[PDB]
Every structure is written in structure tokens, then in C-alpha cells.
């Protein structure tokens, strides 16, 4: 905000320092809290480490054990089965998953040799994307009047325009270059005046 | 964590034995070493910003100026709020 | 003069009782935190929500004390005239000069930097 | 792909007939390329089928007069 | 100034003024007279939990087994491109002065 | 009464001292340099004072 934001506007920065969107919903998703929460759930970008409570690295048999937070796993709408499927698709190689509990499993790495590669595999696994639109770091559901609006910490106009239930004629952004590329130059100058 | 009684290097588990790679020592005792890291999700839940108080006048509401979700309900009939981060006064 | 910003003894007694009530509320918040019965605010941890509750309570205490001090002061002294007409001063200045300063803060937080705990 | 002319940030665009554009440039005392430019690849320029050498008449919303009219010259790129 | 870092690899690296790169903790410890892994581990700490975190650093220096090898490793950075008898003395006279 | 680091390490290794014994001992620093180990550091500070 303030003078740095004004300088950002007048210097024509390609990407803002803090991107932001305001997302409106269609009439059938407009006045339901559960549907808005579902949309916010399925548009927010989530990694594996966002639902893992503890990570255990075993040197004796080259196994990595993952423990999942039940509350976070429910909040993100993620299940352990799809996490296993996502990990199976990775480049890791010949692995072997075994359940240790109803909320835990271990990757046994029947091939790896050293500890450097074991750790590299560990941070490769922890950074794997589970769901969400790229660029969206956090989504917040806000009640303005009788309507529910989604406030986003990131910016992706093309991605959000393809999401179901989004009102594409009312979507807002503070990224003027995306608005120029998608909507044209007159919309861009209207947005510039509004921002200033 | 164990060390070789002769070479002094650390011993790694191979099968049922712990073997020193430099001297070839072996033993019948097995000790398991793991490295456990914890991840905290105290403030990672999904926020729903309805101007409803939790304790006292502290409500959850998005500030139009800075964007923080902390507010003080100054007056209920006017829906008047005040940001706790930048002191901005607004209506929601 | 210096009697324009001096309140009687009953106003001071009322302010003292209000301060005691606010301190009792803060103590109740602290006890609830210690017993694990304190609910957090979304997006913030516990021991960060307790600070918000304490700050809210202390701000309300300052506002109430300022209201009492204004009530038990002459509405036609020169400081009040300078304030209401818009010449110099505000109501926060009168509250701080006549009732209490309130909570001091550094970057939005209470004063914490010092020794250990 | 997607229709964007109905967005609330997009004003109305209209291709201007050659006689009207000629009258406009004569009564302004300018050459066509002295107006603000619009690209032929602009998302709204393609929606109406605008070719370079045309003049687009744009109607925007105003807080002082209600409606305001502006002209742009279509360039290549 | 002497700087000590810990990376995402769980390895500790030492870096001071007169050497351009980062030297592993066990390599620089072997050049100071700590030859075995047990000596380094028990010099760091007595707590098993603390010393279980030195395993990634120990294996990064498994090749180096003596003080002279560590001094050669340091001299490869300090004085590269000369015989393997002045590198050792150059590393010795840098590690004793800076 | 402060026992040095080398003495403690030799006691653990050369003799059969328990490591858990010295995990409950205080650490003593002098001008930021670790000096040794002491059993009850509170009364050491009291007697220094
Ligand atoms: Zn050995
Ligand atoms: Zn604010």
C-alpha cells in the first residue's frame, strides 16, 4: 500500500509484490457456505507437507515414514489413497508402500544406497503437489452481504476462469498485466485508474 | 549410535549385523537410529471471514486496506469495525 | 490553567474500579489459557490470540475511562473549547491528560523485548 | 475460447464506418495515427473483427458525464 | 570471521576468510587432530539425540581418514596447481594463522 | 570443582562411566568458551558470588 504500491503501479511492474484476486460466484453457489467452501478447497494449492504432521527418516533400511494430521487432512478434503497414488506416479523408482496405521504409511526404497539420496528423495516427496490451481497460495471465504466471496492470496486469471461456479464477468485482480493480456487495454487503464 | 571398538568409525546395520566398512568388524547387537521432524499446523486452517465476535469485541473480518483478518467490532448496529493491524475503520 | 485537566475524587474512584474489572477479565483470560480452554482465532496460534484478547480488553478499558473523565469534567473549560471547535487537540489527548495513557505498543505488540521471559 | 466482452471492466467497442472516420479525422485536423493506438491482436479487437487501418469508437462509463466517447486507431501487432 | 551453516542436506559446512569454498565439518575437524569419528561425535555433544544428527556430515567425509588427507583437501582450495608437499604446509600455515 | 571436557570424555571412554550421568550436569562457560562440567551449577554460581 501507499507510496511503494503507487510506484509499482506507475513503473508498470509485470507482477505485483502481493498479488490478490476477488472471486464472485454464480447464483446457485452464491448464498451457500458449503459450496463456497468447496470451491475454495478445490482452488487452493496444496502440497504433501501441508497435511503431514511428522516425517521419520530411517537409516537402517532406507525407509521414510509419513504421519498425517487428521484435522488438516479433512480440512483440505484430501485422502490417503490419492496421496499414495500421487506418490506412486513419481520418479522415485522401485519403491514399496506399507500401511503402519489408519493414518500412516512407509516408503521402503528397496534400491537406494546412501543417505544423501535418501534425504534428496525426502524433500522431493515433501514438495509434491496434491491439488489446487498454480499460483494460489491461500483462499479465504468472506461474507459481504447475503453473498459469499472468495479472497485469494495469489493471482491466476486463466486458471480461475476455468473453475466451475466462478462468475467470470465480475472477477477482480490487482495484476494489471494479466488484465491487459486477458481483457485488453481499456480494461487495463480502467483498472489503473481504480488502483491509483 | 555405535562405533567400532577397533577402528572407531560408526557402525551401520546390514541384515542382522552391524558392519564396519573400514575394518570388517561385526556384532550381535542392533541399534536403530531414526531422524524425526515435526510439522506444526496451528495456523493453517481455512479462514471464514464473517464479522462475528469470538471473545469480547474481537471478530474475524478482512481489512479493505491491509488485508488482515483481525478486527474489533466497534458498533453492532452500524456494522462498524476497526482493523487491529493498521487501525483502519471500515463497514462490513 | 491546571484545573482544566483535574478531575474530582469520585471520577478517580470510578476509574480505579473499572481498571480492577479489566484486570480481572485479563486474569480470567490468562487462567483459561493456562487450563487449555482458550479457543484461537483462525489463522493465528494460541498465545497469539490471548494477546489479541488482552489488547481488546485494555483498549475498551481506556475508552470507558476516558468517557468517565469527560463526564465528570466541565464542558466549558478552555481545553474542551479548543478540542470541540477544532482549534487544537483531540479527545485522545484529553483522555491521556485526564484519565490514563493506556497500553503502549511497539509495531502493534505489547512491550516484550528485554530479559528472558 | 471464452467471451470477455461482457466483463464489467470492458467498455463498448465499435468499428467506425469509413465516411464517419474520414469526417472525424478532417474535423480533428490530424492524421489517423495521431490517435491512441489499439493492436489488431487485442482481445476485444478480435471479438469485433477489427483490421488495421480502422478506427474503433469506445464508450466508457464516467462519473462526470455518464457516458464518454473515445477513438482508437488499429495498428499491426 | 568464521561462519557455520546447516543445509537442507542435514550437513554442516565451515567457511572462513582465506578459503573460497565451504569445507565439511568432519574434514576440518580431522585437520585439527580429531582422527576417529567417535572423537568428533563426543567432542560435539554427549546427548545421543544431538549426536545422531551428525550422521550425514560423517559420511560426507568418509573418504578422508587422516590429518594429512584433510590438509591436502584444504590445500587443493588454498593453493591449487602445485606439488603435494607445499599444499600441506600452506594449509597448515593458513589454518594456524586465520 | 569443575571437571574439564577431556577428563569427562576419558572417564566415559577409558573407564566405564555412564553417559547419562553427565547429561544431568551443568555446563560451565568462561568468556563464551566451554570450560567443563559441574554437578549443581546453581550452587556454583552462589559460591562464586
Ligand atoms: Zn572398525
Ligand atoms: Zn488493516
Curated annotation (Swiss-Prot), chain B:
UniProt-annotated binding residues for Zn(2+) 2: 63, 66, 83, 86
* One BP term from GO: defense response to virus
The annotated region (ZR-C) lies at 55-92
The record's section on PROSITE patterns has: RNA_POL_M_15KD (PS01030)
Q: Which Gene3D superfamilies match?
A: 2.20.70.10
Known cofactor(s): Zn(2+)
Query: Cofactor stoichiometry and binding?
Result: Binds 2 Zn(2+) ions.
For the keyword Zinc, the answer is yes
Query: Keywords on this record?
Result: Antiviral defense, DNA-directed RNA polymerase, Metal-binding, Repressor, Transcription, Transcription regulation, Zinc
Q: Which residues form the active site?
A: 76-78
List GO terms (cellular component aspect). Answer: DNA-directed RNA polymerase complex
The entry's function note states:
A potent inhibitor of RNA polymerase (RNAP) probably involved in viral defense. Destabilizes the transcription pre-initiation complex of TBP, TFB, DNA and RNAP, inhibits abortive transcription initiation, productive initiation and transcription elongation. Increases the RNAP KM for NTPs about 50-fold. Overexpression of TFS1-tip4 (TFS1 with the active tip of this protein, phenocopies this protein) in S.acidocaldarius MW001 leads to severe growth inhibition.
Record note on quaternary structure: Interacts with RNA polymerase.
Descriptive protein name: Transcription factor S4
What organism does this protein naturally occur in?
Saccharolobus solfataricus (strain ATCC 35092 / DSM 1617 / JCM 11322 / P2) (Sulfolobus solfataricus)
Gene for this protein? tfs4
UniProtKB/Swiss-Prot annotation, chain C:
Q: Gene symbol?
A: rpo1N
Subcellular localization, as worded in the UniProt entry: Cytoplasm
Which species is this record about? Answer: Sulfolobus acidocaldarius (strain ATCC 33909 / DSM 639 / JCM 8929 / NBRC 15157 / NCIMB 11770)
Purpose: DNA-dependent RNA polymerase (RNAP) catalyzes the transcription of DNA into RNA using the four ribonucleoside triphosphates as substrates. Forms the clamp head domain.
| Entry coiled-coil feature ranges | none
Look up the further comments and give them. Corresponds to about the first two-thirds of the bacterial beta' subunit.
Name of this protein: DNA-directed RNA polymerase subunit Rpo1N
This protein's assembly is summarised as: Part of the 13-subunit RNA polymerase complex. Interacts with TFS4.
Origin: domain of life: Archaea
Q: Which family, according to UniProt? A: Belongs to the RNA polymerase beta' chain family.
What lineage is on file? Archaea, Thermoproteota, Thermoprotei, Sulfolobales, Sulfolobaceae
From Swiss-Prot, chain D:
Major location (coarse): cytoplasm
What reaction does this enzyme carry out catalytically? Answer: RNA(n) + a ribonucleoside 5'-triphosphate = RNA(n+1) + diphosphate
* Annotated InterPro entries: Arch_Rpo5/euc_Rpb5, RNA_pol_subH/Rpb5_C, RNA_pol_subH/Rpb5_CS, RPB5-like_sf
Say if the entry is tagged with keyword Cell membrane.
Answer: no
GO CC annotation terms, alphabetical = cytoplasm; DNA-directed RNA polymerase complex
> What EC class does the entry list?
transferase
Q: Does the keyword Repeat apply?
A: no
Pfam families attached here?
RNA_pol_Rpb5_C (PF01191)
One GO biological process term: transcription elongation by RNA polymerase I
Q: What is its EC number?
A: 2.7.7.6
Task: Enumerate the subcellular locations listed in this protein's record, separating them with semicolons.
Answer: Cytoplasm
Q: Which residues form a coiled coil?
A: none
| GO molecular function terms attached to this record | DNA binding; DNA-directed RNA polymerase activity
Q: Which UniProt keywords apply?
A: Cytoplasm, DNA-directed RNA polymerase, Nucleotidyltransferase, Transcription, Transferase
Under the subunit heading, UniProt states: Part of the 13-subunit RNA polymerase.
Per the entry, what this protein does is: DNA-dependent RNA polymerase (RNAP) catalyzes the transcription of DNA into RNA using the four ribonucleoside triphosphates as substrates. Reconstitution experiments show this subunit is required for basic activity.
Q: Which family does it belong to?
A: Belongs to the archaeal Rpo5/eukaryotic RPB5 RNA polymerase subunit family.
UniProt-recorded name of the protein: DNA-directed RNA polymerase subunit Rpo5
Organism field: Sulfolobus acidocaldarius (strain ATCC 33909 / DSM 639 / JCM 8929 / NBRC 15157 / NCIMB 11770)
UniProtKB/Swiss-Prot annotation, chain E:
Gene behind this protein: rpo2
Source organism per UniProt: Sulfolobus acidocaldarius (strain ATCC 33909 / DSM 639 / JCM 8929 / NBRC 15157 / NCIMB 11770)
Describe the protein's quaternary organization and the partners it interacts with.
Answer: Part of the 13-subunit RNA polymerase complex. Interacts with TFS4. (Microbial infection) Binds viral protein RIP which blocks global transcription.
Q: What is this protein called?
A: DNA-directed RNA polymerase subunit Rpo2
Q: Shown portion of the whole protein? A: 197 to 294 of 1126
Report the family membership.
Answer: Belongs to the RNA polymerase beta chain family.
This chain's function reads: DNA-dependent RNA polymerase (RNAP) catalyzes the transcription of DNA into RNA using the four ribonucleoside triphosphates as substrates. This subunit is involved in DNA promoter recognition.
- What domain of life? Archaea
Task: List localization entries.
Answer: Cytoplasm
